[PDB]
Amino acid sequence: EKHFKYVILGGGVAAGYAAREFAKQGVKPGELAIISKEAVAPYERPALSKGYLFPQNAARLPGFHVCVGSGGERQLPEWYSEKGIELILSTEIVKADLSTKTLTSAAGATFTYEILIIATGSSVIKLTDFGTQGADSNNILYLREIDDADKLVAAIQAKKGGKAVVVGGGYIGLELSAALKINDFDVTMVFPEPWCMPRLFTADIAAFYEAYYTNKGVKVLKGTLAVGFDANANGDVTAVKLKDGKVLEADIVVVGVGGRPLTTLFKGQVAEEKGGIKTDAFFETSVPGVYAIGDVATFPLKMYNELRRVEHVDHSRKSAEQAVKAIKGKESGESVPEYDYLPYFYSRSFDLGWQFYGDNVGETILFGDSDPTSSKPKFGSYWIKDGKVFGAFLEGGSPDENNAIAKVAKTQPPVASIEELKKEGLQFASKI
Ligand SMILES: Cc1cc2c(cc1C)N(C[C@H](O)[C@H](O)[C@H](O)COP(=O)(O)OP(=O)(O)OC[C@H]1O[C@@H](n3cnc4c(N)ncnc43)[C@H](O)[C@@H]1O)c1[nH]c(=O)[nH]c(=O)c1N2
Numbered sequence: 055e056k057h058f059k060y061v062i063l064g065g066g067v068a069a070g071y072a073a074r075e076f077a078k079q080g081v082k083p084g085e086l087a088i089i090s091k092e093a094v095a096p097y098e099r100p101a102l103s104k105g106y107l108f109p110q111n112a113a114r115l116p117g118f119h120v121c122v123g124s125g126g127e128r129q130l131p132e133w134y135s136e137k138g139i140e141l142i143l144s145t146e147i148v149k150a151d152l153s154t155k156t157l158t159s160a161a162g163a164t165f166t167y168e169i170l171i172i173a174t175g176s177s178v179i180k181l182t183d184f185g186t187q188g189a190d191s192n193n194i195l196y197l198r199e200i201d202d203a204d205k206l207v208a209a210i211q212a213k214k215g216g217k218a219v220v221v222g223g224g225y226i227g228l229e230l231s232a233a234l235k236i237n238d239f240d241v242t243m244v245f246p247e248p249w250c251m252p253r254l255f256t257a258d259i260a261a262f263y264e265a266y267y268t269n270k271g272v273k274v275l276k277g278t279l280a281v282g283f284d285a286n287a288n289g290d291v292t293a294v295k296l297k298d299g300k301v302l303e304a305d306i307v308v309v310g311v312g313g314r315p316l317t318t319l320f321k322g323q324v325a326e327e328k329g330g331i332k333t334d335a336f337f338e339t340s341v342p343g344v345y346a347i348g349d350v351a352t353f354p355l356k357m358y359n360e361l362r363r364v365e366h367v368d369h370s371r372k373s374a375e376q377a378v379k380a381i382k383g384k385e386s387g388e389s390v391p392e393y394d395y396l397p398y399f400y401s402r403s404f405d406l407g408w409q410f411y412g413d414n415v416g417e418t419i420l421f422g423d424s425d426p427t428s429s430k431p432k433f434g435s436y437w438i439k440d441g442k443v444f445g446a447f448l449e450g451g452s453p454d455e456n457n458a459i460a461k462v463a464k465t466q467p468p469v470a471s472i473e474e475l476k477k478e479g480l481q482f483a484s485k486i
């Protein structure tokens with residue numbers, strides 16, 4: 055049994071950014087521990103679907119350890135031990151008892167805390183959840199952690215020059231199809247929805263990327279579903295069978311069909327809301343001294359007066375700082391302001407790069423140049439509900455053009471005329 059005043063459960067992005075805030079708040083040696091099932095100190099997870107997979111000049115640890123992804127300093131394992139912050143790596147907690155403040159690992163080790171910070175992130179939904187035949191064949195890969203990224207880098211070198219199938223049309227589907235393409239793979243994207251990124255992209259935004267990906271040689275099969283996989287004698291995947299009977303040849307298969315908050319250790323012990331652990335504006339759960347941050351928390355999104363859950367890296371960084379300030383603030387009888395978050399999402403693929411700020415509610419208006427064969431495409435979209443701008447998307451924008459649409463999403467300016475908004479386009483944001 056090891057006791058610590060503060061225990062961060064998980065060693066991902068929120069854990070690393072909470073550790074940075076703890077050091078900034080004068081944490082003392084022996085006070086804080088980070089328990090992680092990963093063998094490495096916290097890192098900027100977004101690099102795993104991008105830089106990590108490049109055929110040349112690839113991103114490797116320790117380069118992308120936190121907090122460099124936000125322009126902060128690198129926190130190598132020594133950053134922690136110099137401060138008396140115990141990193142407990144390769145340790146998976148299989149039981150958590152909030153009533154006795156005890157965490158129990160797979161090997162039966164126990165750890166106690168005074169303050170717990172749940173930062174377990176998201177699970178990887180696997181094709182077994184839909185009873186897909188052959189989903190256990192070798193080379194049917196998923197991407198969540200650095201070990202998955204290493205197994206993917208190796209399968210890429212092994213099957214290079216061959217055929218890849220990507221099941222999923224979300225973030226992983228779009229980013230991984232691009233990764234396999236640049237790695238000399240013949241890629242097919244498969245997903246059941248009528249267009250890519252259905253939870254964010256309109257049919258018009260999606261159509262730009264479908265045409266773009268097609269010209270790069272990526273076959274995008276909309277309205278398609280994988281129902282099985284063929285495998286050879288060694289058990290390696292050889293093909294992907296679709297609901298319509300079409301069979302695609304596959305040397306490697308990559309799947310991105312969503313993630314769920316990794317809350318399994320606390321079911322029945324914390325209040326929940328839409329899959330996540332329900333928190334207040336300071337990330338404290340229904341149990342005093344227990345906080346939940348990043349991907350697992352369903353917190354009040356102040357701007358929209360609703361409880362929301364965000365499974366993106368910007369929120370994992372901002373929520374971590376909020377919970378640590380809330381814990382340290384209470385120790386001095388002080389209160390900190392409520393979390394005031396502006397949902398910020400982004401994706402990168404090929405020579406493209408988009409940003410989204412706010413909420414994708416109401417009706418949309420496409421602006422700019424959305425031609426996929428243009429050398430420098432720049433186009434965006436606005437989301438309008440109740441006469442005001444709620445959301446703003448922009449592909450190919452400059453730093454100041456991205457901050458202009460972010461300003462629009464924060465301030466929710468009124469739209470007296472949609473005809474004028476369509477006519478101004480990106481200038482509506484740049485002016486305001
Ligand atoms: C490959 C890939 C690529 C991207 C992204 C995700 C993925 C999977 N994201 C999403 C973003 O990385 C994500 O929102 C943050 O990692 C969330 O930070 P957390 O700390 O909440 O979870 P995160 O998953 O980072 O950390 C959870 C940690 O808890 C550990 N853990 C869980 N259960 C445990 C247990 N029982 N015992 C011990 N340890 C345990 C995990 O092993 C991990 O170390 C993204 N977002 C974005 O906006 N832009 C981007 O470009 C990307 N790119």
Ligand SMILES: NC(=O)c1ccc[n+]([C@@H]2O[C@H](COP(=O)([O-])OP(=O)(O)OC[C@H]3O[C@@H](n4cnc5c(N)ncnc54)[C@H](O)[C@@H]3O)[C@@H](O)[C@H]2O)c1
Pocket residue numbers: 103176184221222223224225226227229244245246247251252253279280309310311312313365366399400401402
């Ligand atoms: N740039 C980024 O923001 C980025 C990049 C990579 C990963 N991520 C994060 O990592 C996590 C995993 O991403 P993801 O792409 O797996 O999730 P996702 O939620 O973005 O997309 C999964 C998509 O696959 C669809 N799908 C579900 N079942 C399917 C099936 N049987 N066949 C095909 N498609 C199916 C879903 O409806 C959804 O559209 C998420 O939390 C995501 O936000 C984010």
